[PDB]
Amino acid sequence: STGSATTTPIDSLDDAYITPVQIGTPAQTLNLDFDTGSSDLWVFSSETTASEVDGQTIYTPSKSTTAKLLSGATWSISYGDGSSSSGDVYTDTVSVGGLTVTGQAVESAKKVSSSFTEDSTIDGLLGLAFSTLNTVSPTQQKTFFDNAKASLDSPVFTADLGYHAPGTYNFGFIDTTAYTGSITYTAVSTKQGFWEWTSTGYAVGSGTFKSTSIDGIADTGTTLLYLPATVVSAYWAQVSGAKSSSSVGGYVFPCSATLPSFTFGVGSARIVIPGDYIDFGPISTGSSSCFGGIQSSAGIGINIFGDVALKAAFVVFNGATTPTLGFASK
Ligand SMILES: OCc1cnc(N2CCOCC2)s1
Ligand code: NA
Structure with a gap:
């Protein structure tokens, strides 16, 4: 298998890039920040404290026929910029640019820090660092890439970011x-x-x-x-x-x-x-x-x-x- 998805700057400075991601059945499309420096796939959700949501698209697990609570699992992450988020966990089907993973851990935010709330263009993060950094407790979870890897034509992904322009994330081929x-x-x-x-x-x-x-x-x-x-x-x-x-x-x-x-x-x-x-x-x-x-x-x-x-x-x-x-x- 392979996937290919366009990634788009969130603003005129290229402060970050968002990539659409299909979650659940029927698909719920959220625009996620693909992050090779972290290992959690987390989303704004129907569980996120309402005063911490300001324009983001949310994942609603109760509307996905394939969502299941990962009972007892929680997560909590702090990034290098001082931002943070935490919550609980569902497993669901996740698709990036045609590549589908079943049983992906989708970390549903109950709380996010102010920098996330204030950025209406980012609906969550998709971590692409090694799964050893994943914060889910008590059972650490795998990244989307680690779950996709065995299905891919080649165990690779590529980042082709644009300067003041869209670019591409490819999975499984160069x-x-x-x-x-x-x-x-x-x-x-x-x-x-x-x-x-x-x-x-x-x-x-x-x-x-x-x-x-x-x-x-x-x-x-x-x-x-x-x-x-x-x-x-x-x-x-x-x-x-x-x-x-x-x-x-x-x-x-x-x-x-x-x-x-x-x-x-x-x-x-x-x-x-x-x-x-x-x-x-x-x-x-x-x-x-x-x-x-x-x-x-x-x-x-x-x-x-x-x-x-x-x-x-x-x-x-x-x-x-x-x-x-x-x-x-x-
Ligand atoms: O404000 C404290 C500074 C530290 N280093 C500086 N620069 C000046 C420009 O040339 C390189 C170094 S200014
Ligand atoms: Na700044």
């Missing part, structure tokens, strides 16, 4: 028309449950490439690129007037600037992030200070190759017995 050149594969550590890999270095603009190992995670659920403070300082020093702002909470730059590109290494290959991709626009409406898309990881404990980096590439998440990541230009 679309050789979707990238240029060849795919460079690199080793993955699953020790922390993430798609954790080591970049071979970086360059700023037209500058020399610096060979240095940078261990980080491929995380479709994080907007920005978070790297060590040394690397980030070296980038923003090439932008006149850029500075780290403790009042704003990261690097800002004059909106009049033209940003340099940023290159990261994948083995002997190079992925170039255009300067445009690193513009996250005014800090507040009408401001002439703009927010940078490359920020320090120093106050996180891990480097994160979020959407800023991933959308410059065609990315293969290879879930074979020995997992690997692949990157190609596009």
Whole structure:
């Protein structure tokens, strides 16, 4: 089997991407944030505290002929941005872009934090990190990918995120028309449950490439690129007037600037992030200070190759017995 689904930016900044997902019978279509940095499939639901729902589409298990309560199971998750959600669990049929899984754990939110309520465009998350991170208790559950894997033509999924444009998530096959050149594969550590890999270095603009190992995670659920403070300082020093702002909470730059590109290494290959991709626009409406898309990881404990980096590439998440990541230009 295979599936293929279009993923669409939620706003003009590419703050996140939503992908329609069919849940239940008859289908209930919810727009979920596919997150390679977490391992829970959770949704706004008929159980979510009513004052915490503001425009989201909800899953109603009582209207699905295939829903079953997963009796006694609960879940509770906290993300790197301080957001959280929790609830109970149903099993149901879940379809992504034609690929169907029966018996998928669908985590129904009873509570969500303010950042979820305030984002009317995201109806929940679909986690694509390793199932060791799944929060369901007392019986940990599998991700959609882990449940689909044995049925897939090839045990892979690919992320092809757009810059200010739709892109694609594919399951079970690698679309050789979707990238240029060849795919460079690199080793993955699953020790922390993430798609954790080591970049071979970086360059700023037209500058020399610096060979240095940078261990980080491929995380479709994080907007920005978070790297060590040394690397980030070296980038923003090439932008006149850029500075780290403790009042704003990261690097800002004059909106009049033209940003340099940023290159990261994948083995002997190079992925170039255009300067445009690193513009996250005014800090507040009408401001002439703009927010940078490359920020320090120093106050996180891990480097994160979020959407800023991933959308410059065609990315293969290879879930074979020995997992690997692949990157190609596009
Ligand atoms: O505001 C505290 C700062 C820390 N690092 C800064 N930058 C300035 C621009 O060139 C790179 C480094 S400003
Ligand atoms: Na922000």
